[PDB]
Amino acid sequence: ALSLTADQMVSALLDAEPPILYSESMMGLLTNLADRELVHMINWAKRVPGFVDLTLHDQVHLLESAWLEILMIGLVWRSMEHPGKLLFAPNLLLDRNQGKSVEGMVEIFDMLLATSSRFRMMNLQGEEFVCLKSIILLNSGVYTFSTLKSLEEKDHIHRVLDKITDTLIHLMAKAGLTLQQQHQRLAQLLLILSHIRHMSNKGMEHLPLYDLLLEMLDAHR
Amino acid sequence: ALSLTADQMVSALLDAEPPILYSESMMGLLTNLADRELVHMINWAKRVPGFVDLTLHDQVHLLESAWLEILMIGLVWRSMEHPGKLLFAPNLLLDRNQGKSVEGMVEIFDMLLATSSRFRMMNLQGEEFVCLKSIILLNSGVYTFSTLKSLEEKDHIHRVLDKITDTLIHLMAKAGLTLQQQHQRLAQLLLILSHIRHMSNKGMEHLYSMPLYDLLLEMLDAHR
Ligand SMILES: Oc1ccc2c(c1)CCN(c1ccccc1)[C@@H]2c1ccc(N2CCN3CCCC[C@H]3C2)cc1
Numbered sequence: 001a002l003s004l005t006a007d008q009m010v011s012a013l014l015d016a017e018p019p020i021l022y023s024e025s026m027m028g029l030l031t032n033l034a035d036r037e038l039v040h041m042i043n044w045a046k047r048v049p050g051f052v053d054l055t056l057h058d059q060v061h062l063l064e065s066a067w068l069e070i071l072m073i074g075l076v077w078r079s080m081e082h083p084g085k086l087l088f089a090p091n092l093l094l095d096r097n098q099g100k101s102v103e104g105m106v107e108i109f110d111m112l113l114a115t116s117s118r119f120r121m122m123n124l125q126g127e128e129f130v131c132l133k134s135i136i137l138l139n140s141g142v143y144t145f146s147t148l149k150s151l152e153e154k155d156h157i158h159r160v161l162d163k164i165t166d167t168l169i170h171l172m173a174k175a176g177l178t179l180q181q182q183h184q185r186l187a188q189l190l191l192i193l194s195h196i197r198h199m200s201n202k203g204m205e206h207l208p209l210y211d212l213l214l215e216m217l218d219a220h221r
Numbered sequence: 222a223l224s225l226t227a228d229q230m231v232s233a234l235l236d237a238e239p240p241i242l243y244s245e246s247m248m249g250l251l252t253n254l255a256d257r258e259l260v261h262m263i264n265w266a267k268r269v270p271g272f273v274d275l276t277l278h279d280q281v282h283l284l285e286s287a288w289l290e291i292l293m294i295g296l297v298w299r300s301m302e303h304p305g306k307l308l309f310a311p312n313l314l315l316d317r318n319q320g321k322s323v324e325g326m327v328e329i330f331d332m333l334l335a336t337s338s339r340f341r342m343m344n345l346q347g348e349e350f351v352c353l354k355s356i357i358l359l360n361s362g363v364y365t366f367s368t369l370k371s372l373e374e375k376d377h378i379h380r381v382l383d384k385i386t387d388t389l390i391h392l393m394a395k396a397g398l399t400l401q402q403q404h405q406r407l408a409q410l411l412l413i414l415s416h417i418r419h420m421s422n423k424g425m426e427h428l429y430s431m432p433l434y435d436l437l438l439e440m441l442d443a444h445r
């Protein structure tokens with residue numbers, strides 16, 4: 001995981017991508033969809049290089065912090081060449097007007113559209129996207145875990161995150177961006193993660209979970 | 222503003238730094254302190270390179286999204302040398318015992334400590350801190366503004382952000398960090414901003430249940 005080339009990390013991440021799921025009241029549909037996405041997110045996480053070095057208990061706490069942001073970054077990714085619209089599933093596409101029954105998601109809806117438009121303008125690549133999704137998984141919960149060794153289990157998370165930063169920069173050098181453009185784009189991308197956090201907390205207010213993730217993360221062949 | 226050097230950007234920000242204010246019910250003392258800090262943050266915000274270039278309403282929008290993250294990162298910065306404690310004021314230092322008696326503080330107290338101790342482990346420099354703050358100001362509100370004119374204002378904000386990113390990097394080079402170390406530290410800092418947005422969202426949920434656009438509108442006009 002520390003030992004991977006920047007290229008094997010990208011390849012490991014591309015090839016771990018979850019499938020795009022189909023749709024099956026509006027909030028019923030979205031809830032059914034998300035709940036099925038969750039199962040696949042657990043499988044993706046276990047293949048994020050470095051995640052499975054962690055203790056089971058730290059894997060749960062990280063996924064518990066991060067799961068909504070992960071569904072959102074997904075959604076925004078597949079909505080990208082779909083201006084004005086959210087592609088929840090290839091058979092459930094909603095325009096701005098169609099959050100006109102689900103009160104509340106109206107703030108969120110516009111926030112996701114804006115995130116999607118931003119990825120569009122930046123010309124966000126899939127290799128970059130899987131790097132950013134991996135950072136959310138490692139980061140969202142890292143500041144919310146302190147015996148001494150405890151802090152050593154945190155340090156490894158930060159080693160892996162540095163390793164994903166090296167990877168994003170490597171992909172940027174490869175495409176021939178200057179050292180200055182490299183730094184600027186990396187920052188633009190990391191700053192968008194502030195906004196995805198904001199969206200998840202507003203989403204959480206509008207929406208135990210530990211057991212559910214713990215049972216799912218623990219699977220018998 | 223886009224003409225600035227890294228060093229001149231730094232000098233502008235350092236010069237614009239608000240003073241550290243004193244405390245005069247614990248929630249009562251904190252409200253009164255943050256309310257007086259808010260006047261100084263307008264003064265500071267007006268001297269962030271690129272901020273006065275924006276329309277009045279864009280300026281209000283940004284301060285509306287950011288002000289509480291700006292109070293928290295200031296808090297966390299002056300708290301760096303006080304493990305277990307939050308230095309709200311030089312005469313108002315709270316530890317965990319006081320911290321559980323303050324409503325709204327109960328979720329965020331440990332998040333604030335963690336941020337402080339993280340800045341403490343990383344040895345954040347004052348030149349780095351003033352850059353992260355300006356970034357918060359220009360970034361927090363930038364994806365919750367769709368006209369052609371709005372597209373041009375967001376373009377500006379994003380160009381000003383690229384020049385603060387440049388300044389952060391220049392500073393790390395100067396301090397002798399390798400290129401790798403430079404990117405790595407850039408990301409670690411920008412990732413902590415994500416946690417500062419989390420704590421603001423949490424803190425905000427409490428403060429809103431205890432009109433801001435119009436108060437900051439009148440404060441930016443009063444600065445005239
Ligand atoms: O890919 C998706 C799928 C669904 C959603 C999003 C992306 C992004 C936006 N989101 C949302 C969040 C809050 C309010 C309105 C919409 C829905 C979504 C809907 C429901 C859920 N939940 C419902 C309950 N269930 C509880 C068990 C754990 C998972 C959780 C998922 C998650 C996301």
Ligand SMILES: Oc1ccc2c(c1)CCN(c1ccccc1)[C@@H]2c1ccc(N2CCN3CCCC[C@H]3C2)cc1
Pocket residue numbers: 251252254255256258259292293295296309323324325326424425427428433
């Ligand atoms: O530098 C400071 C000063 C005070 C505070 C912080 C940093 C960081 C955390 N914070 C807080 C947050 C939630 C619950 C309890 C305390 C207090 C703080 C207290 C009050 C306010 N408010 C009170 C009401 N007032 C309403 C008018 C607009 C400004 C707003 C400021 C802001 C921060």
